Design a protein around this nucleic acid. Structure first.
Ligand SMILES: Nc1ncnc2c1ncn2[C@@H]1O[C@H](COP(=O)(O)OP(=O)(O)OP(O)(O)=S)[C@@H](O)[C@H]1O
Ligand SMILES: Nc1ncnc2c1ncn2[C@@H]1O[C@H](COP(=O)(O)OP(=O)(O)OP(O)(O)=S)[C@@H](O)[C@H]1O
Ligand SMILES: [Mg+2]
Ligand SMILES: [Mg+2]
Lengths: 98, 333, 32, 333
DNA sequence: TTTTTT
């Protein structure tokens, strides 16, 4: 049973189709499936579904030395949570299905 | 030719609208006296200065919020007393069920004329406010602790039952049905709000207000009142130092701050505000800890200066009027 | 049977918007 | 042989339709001058750039929404003032009952010529807008806070009564009855919307706008205006930093953004927008914190550059024409 | 369609 194998909180788990290639070094590529657990609090270094200034993004969460959203691709650049930036984390990616 | 036809069509449309809906349905903004902003004193001169227009606007919605024991009820009762001193009729919807009539009387509120309601449900509270606005005989209405505006379904429910956003629905509908009635009857509706915590907020203000977002949009003036210290007569704490920050203003410039003392059993220290405003406006000279008015040394320290100024009414009124014509950006007619 | 939102989340750049027209499916039917 | 018969049949059908419904009932799209997109400035040059066509389209429907105190009414009043400077007639249907005529005058609006309506119900507001559109003498109509477009049934009802989607049906019927009238009369209808929270959203934007979904479909341009900072003169907050996102655009490319400063008592900072656009278009040199034009150091910082460009109208006009010629994708005739 | 809650 895959549901018992991969899902801990069935009532707070949704699937997301990945787009773009800024997470390739982190194991996420364009078209992949992202299983997101919205019932668990995000931590430093976790992979999260986040929205910056109302714009949704998949990124790695860092809280030190500053709050930022960093990708896992050398081509792309980190997103720094600047003044009047509302970083809304909508869950933590727990699994990537290719 | 074309301009004349356009003017004819515009006049015909205006007449049609006036016939269909009424005389005051549509008219030019310049000659609409019902849209002029009328304000009443809030009981604090510094707050009136920070509000720009001279006080809370009549016919609008005002939200006052802050932490526990920050003086929301005291400021509201001072506003009500100031309104009643002008002959207006005020109403108090005590949804928190935590009003002390004796303390309200001690602040100067005419208890015998203040309409007090302790509604069971939030719907009952908002319907009473709507009825009082529609009557037109009430000038100031206050909803104490809209956080306590619990819906009827929540009351009839159980503890732990999830009523998800029901209070938000009820409050949004209340604003929608109340804005026009308040504007029509020229009634000031003050909503008192408590501060809750936004969990999981990493960057930003972690404090939100109860009731949803409708009050944020509909309120003409939103005041964040906080206690920043204590007023001590040596040992006993006789008052509190209060800061009011105007986080929203639809009648003047926002983000101004007002600092004043709330003395227990007396209300807002008007004379202390007078001392501070005279000092700021170069009316009262301050040499270190020594305050002086026109060379005469009046006392040592803010408390002694305030006591001096209490002991004399004449230059009290003098400094008050000078400050009022100087600092007030928008003097009321 | 869990939501599979129609809109795709852009990992490269912050997507202009994210509507959530919700389509629901189970893991076993989706992968096997 | 066959093509001639087909052409004859098409011509006969076109003539029959023209006789039945009118001269302009049907015609080739290339020779239909009424379908051309005509635009008016929004009071913000960067927003005109972001809209592609140089401003909001005439004869269409535009929705403006955002959080509280984001500048919806100020942007609308700048649009109205820009229209009135061109001789157009504008109307303001304020459902919020929270319009300040003095501030509207301070933004450049001719309050002596702006039609203002305080509708009691949403149906009354939409009927007034329909009448103004059908007149053809009004160029810009604004509905303030369609969240306040309360149905008559809800007005006559009680607080807590459930009116499921009744406002949505009223808005849908209004859009259906208004689109054709606005297109025929070349009237721009701007809808101001508030933002409500969406409960139980696992993924996606948890914010909608009041009024239902018909306004989403019928709007030619939808703007998302937000306050992303404050403009400070050292200590006092004299303005707000605003970002406007074009989330929908039927006349140009969407999702373009504009940044401008809204100054209290003045409105959108046009000269700062000129500074920023000249800097972006390699017309004004920025060396760190130093702004220079053609070698001449105009000042230090955005505020000093704006003051200098205000002090020299000739160079301001020069840079304005250069920026308008260069940046504008669709320069209006 | 409607609207947060700690
Ligand atoms: N009857 C009273 N006599 C003397 N001091 C009082 C009395 N009631 C309140 N106070 C004090 O007056 C200050 C402000 O009181 P309030 O206006 O009730 O504060 P509040 O904003 O209403 O906060 P809440 O409603 O209790 S959560 C506090 O320091 C209180 O301790
Ligand atoms: N009369 C006024 N004098 C000075 N500043 C004002 C005045 N009215 C509004 N402002 C400020 O101008 C900015 C934009 O004002 P608005 O146009 O009313 O914003 P808004 O989008 O309409 O927000 P709402 O309608 O209250 S939800 C805000 O920072 C207001 O505080
Ligand atoms: Mg209270
Ligand atoms: Mg407004």
């Amino acid at each position: 049973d895959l549901n018992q194998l991969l899902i801990q909180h069935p009532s707070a788990t949704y699937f997301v189709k990945a787009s773009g290639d800024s997470m390739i070094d982190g194991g996420i590529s364009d078209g992949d499936l992202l299983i997101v657990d919205s019932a668990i609090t995000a931590s430093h270094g976790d992979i999260v579904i986040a929205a910056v200034d109302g714009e949704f993004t998949v990124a790695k969460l860092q809280l030190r030395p500053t709050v930022q959203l960093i990708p896992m691709n050398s081509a792309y650049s980190p997103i720094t949570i600047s003044s009047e930036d509302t970083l809304d984390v909508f869950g933590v990616v727990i699994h990537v299905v290719k | 030719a074309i301009d004349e036809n356009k003017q004819k069509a515009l006049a015909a449309a205006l007449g049609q609208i006036e016939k269909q809906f009424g005389k005051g349905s549509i008219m030019r903004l310049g000659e609409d006296r019902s849209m002029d902003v009328e304000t009443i004193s809030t009981g604090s001169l510094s707050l009136d200065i920070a509000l720009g227009a001279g006080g809370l606007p009549m016919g609008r919605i005002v939200e006052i919020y802050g932490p526990e024991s920050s003086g929301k009820t005291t400021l509201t009762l001072q506003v009500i007393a100031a309104a009643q001193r002008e002959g207006k009729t005020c109403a108090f919807i005590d949804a928190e069920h935590a009003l002390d009539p004796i303390y309200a009387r001690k602040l100067g509120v005419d208890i015998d004329n203040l309409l007090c309601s302790q509604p069971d449900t939030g719907e009952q509270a908002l319907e009473i406010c709507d009825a009082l606005a529609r009557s037109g005989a009430v000038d100031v209405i206050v909803v104490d602790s809209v956080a306590a505006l619990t819906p009827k379904a929540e009351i009839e429910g159980e503890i732990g039952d999830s009523h998800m956003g029901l209070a938000a629905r009820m409050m949004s509908q209340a604003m929608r049905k109340l804005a026009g009635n308040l504007k029509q009857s020229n009634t000031l509706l003050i909503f008192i709000n408590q501060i809750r915590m936004k969990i999981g907020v990493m960057f930003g203000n972690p404090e939100t207000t109860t009731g949803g977002n409708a009050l944020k949009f509909y309120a003409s003036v939103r005041l964040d009142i906080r206690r920043i210290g204590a007023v001590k007569e040596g040992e006993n704490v006789v008052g509190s130092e209060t800061r009011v920050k105007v986080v929203k203003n639809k009648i003047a410039a926002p983000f101004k701050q007002a600092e004043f003392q709330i003395l227990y059993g007396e209300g807002i220290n008007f004379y202390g505000e007078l001392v501070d405003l005279g000092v700021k406006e170069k009316l009262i000279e301050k040499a270190g800890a020594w305050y002086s008015y026109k060379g005469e040394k009046i006392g040592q320290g803010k408390a002694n200066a305030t006591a001096w100024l209490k002991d004399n009414p004449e230059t009290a009124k003098e400094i008050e009027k000078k400050v009022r014509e100087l600092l007030l950006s928008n003097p009321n007619s | 049977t869990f939501p599979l939102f129609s809109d795709l989340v852009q990992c490269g750049f912050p997507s202009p918007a994210a509507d959530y027209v919700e389509q629901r499916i189970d893991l076993n039917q989706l992968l096997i």
